[PDB]
Amino acid sequence: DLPLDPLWEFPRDRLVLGKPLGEGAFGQVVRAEAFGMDPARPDQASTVAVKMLKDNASDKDLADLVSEMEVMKLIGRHKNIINLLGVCTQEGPLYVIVECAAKGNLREFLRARRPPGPDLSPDGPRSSEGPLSFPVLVSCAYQVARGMQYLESRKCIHRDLAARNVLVTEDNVMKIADFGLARGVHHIDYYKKTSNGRLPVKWMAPEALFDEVYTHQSDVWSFGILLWEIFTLGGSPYPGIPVEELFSLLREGHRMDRPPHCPPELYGLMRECWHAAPSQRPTFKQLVEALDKVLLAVSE
Numbered sequence: 001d002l003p004l005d006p007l008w009e010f011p012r013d014r015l016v017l018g019k020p021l022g023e024g025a026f027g028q029v030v031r032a033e034a035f036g037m038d039p040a041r042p043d044q045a046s047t048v049a050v051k052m053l054k055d056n057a058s059d060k061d062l063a064d065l066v067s068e069m070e071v072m073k074l075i076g077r078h079k080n081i082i083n084l085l086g087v088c089t090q091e092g093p094l095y096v097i098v099e100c101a102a103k104g105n106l107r108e109f110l111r112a113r114r115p116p117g118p119d120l121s122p123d124g125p126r127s128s129e130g131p132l133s134f135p136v137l138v139s140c141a142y143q144v145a146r147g148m149q150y151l152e153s154r155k156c157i158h159r160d161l162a163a164r165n166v167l168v169t170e171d172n173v174m175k176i177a178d179f180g181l182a183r184g185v186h187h188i189d190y191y192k193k194t195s196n197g198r199l200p201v202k203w204m205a206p207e208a209l210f211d212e213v214y215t216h217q218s219d220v221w222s223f224g225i226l227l228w229e230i231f232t233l234g235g236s237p238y239p240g241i242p243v244e245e246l247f248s249l250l251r252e253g254h255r256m257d258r259p260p261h262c263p264p265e266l267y268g269l270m271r272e273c274w275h276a277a278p279s280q281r282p283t284f285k286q287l288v289e290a291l292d293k294v295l296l297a298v299s300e
């Protein structure tokens with residue numbers, strides 16, 4: 001009943017819905033198998049993610065999903081974002097089909113790969129060597145920056161950039177997810193805590209939190225927070241600080257401390273991202289180039 005866009009339209013009967021990945025404020029995400037996503041290979045199988053309305057479905061829910069779908073189309077394709085693959089709008093429920101990232105989000109990726117503590121017994125030549133190395137952590141930060149740079153060039157503001165919203169592929173490629181969401185910026189529950197204990201207010205730029213102003217520079221603030229997440233190996237920002245205390249600390253200009261085992265180069269970038277004046281924060285272009293220098297210097 002929605003208009004037909006043969007460019008993106010995909011036969012729903014070529015989808016086999018599987019296990020649900022989670023829910024959102026609007027819609028739910030389900031893992032699914034797709035057959036012939038590449039029209040040159042009609043019978044080949046691929047794993048995809050399918051966005052769809054819940055049965056909570058109001059019209060505002062539908063409008064938001066349609067809104068997200070159309071944003072996806074216009075943004076285009078990039079290596080470091082979750083790309084649109086197709087849509088199902090004819091003769092059935094609305095499906096928005098996007099890419100699969102095998103390893104989950106960046107936060108859980110890092111937390112599951114924290115080095116072994118002093119408690120597990122040494123076994124082998126690499127008992128002290130954890131999965132995560134410094135250049136790979138820098139690469140993760142660099143890829144997110146390039147992804148955001150692309151989104152910025154396409155006039156897209158994420159408004160909730162975080163490690164939880166960055167997905168990891170089988171080849172450890174960072175892919176920014178949920179960049180085109182209507183997040184209800186005029187009614188945000190600042191005290192809201194997610195089912196996994198996340199307080200999304202801790203990623204908000206001051207101008208976003210206090211003035212409801214969003215720019216690409218407000219995303220840069222969030223990227224600084226994400227940087228802190230990465231080099232704390234998936235740690236929660238502002239440790240032990242409730243939302244009420246966050247408000248007053250931010251008004252006092254409080255900033256997070258330099259995390260352990262984090263070089264000054266990267267904490268420097270964090271503080272730059274957290275400058276009070278949005279124009280005094282680096283652009284994503286500058287972040288990409290800054291992170292590239294570090295990355296190239298440690299990839300001999």
Ligand SMILES: *[C@@H](C1CC1)[C@@H](C#N)C(=O)Nc1cc(N2CCC(N3CCOCC3)CC2)cc(F)c1Nc1n[nH]c2ccc(O[C@H](C)c3c(Cl)cncc3Cl)cc12
Nearest residue numbers: 021022029031047048049099100101102104105164167177
């Ligand atoms: C690839 C995706 C097409 C489905 C697929 C494979 N293989 C996959 O499942 N990818 C994936 C899985 C997960 N999980 C993390 C939670 C975990 N549960 C089982 C263990 O105990 C409880 C937790 C298994 C499932 C998270 C992921 F982010 C992905 N990757 C992924 N790829 N494309 C996605 C599209 C949307 C999406 O949204 C969900 C709601 C999401 C979750 Cl579940 C977590 N963090 C962020 C987001 Cl956006 C995830 C997508």
